[PDB]
Design a protein around this ligand. Sequence first.
Ligand SMILES: O=P(O)(O)OP(=O)(O)OC[C@H]1OC[C@@H](F)[C@@H]1O
Length: 140
Amino acid sequence: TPDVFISYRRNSGSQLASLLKVHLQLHGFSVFIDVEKLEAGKFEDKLIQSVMGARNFVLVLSPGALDKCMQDHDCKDWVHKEIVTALSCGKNIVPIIDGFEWPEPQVLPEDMQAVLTFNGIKWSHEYQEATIEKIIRFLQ
Ligand SMILES: O=P(O)(O)OP(=O)(O)OC[C@H]1OC[C@@H](F)[C@@H]1O
C-alpha cells in the first residue's frame, strides 16, 4: 500500500496536496490522496486503514487548516481524525506549511496537540524544487 498519506483541508489545501502528490510520485513514492485512492466502501474505515498503512504522513497546513479541529473533542473532523491516527501510530509526520499560522497548543484537542512538535517544511513558491528535495529528505 502507499508509503505516503497526504492529509489536507479540501477547501484550502487541495491544489498544494495535488502538487505534492505529483512530485512525490515522480520521485518514486507510492502516495495516497483521497481523490485518487479512496475507493468503494465505508470511508471512515478506508481512511483510517490508509493512514495506518503509510509510514509517512504529510500534513498540508494551508491557512486555517486546523480551524475545524478546534473544539472538535468528539473527533468528528476528518483532518483531526487523520492526525490522531498518525500520532497514535507513531507515523513519520511531515507538516508542510503554506501560509499557516501556528496556533497555541491549548486551542486544539489534547489528542492532537503533539502535531505541533514535529519539524515542519515551509513551502516556497519561489524555490519549489528545493522544497520538494527537502520533503524527500524527510520521508522514510
Ligand atoms: O470530509 P471533508 O469534510 O469533505 O474533508 P476535509 O477537507 O474536512 O478533510 C479531508 C481529509 O480528511 C481525510 C483525508 F483523506 C482528507 O485529506
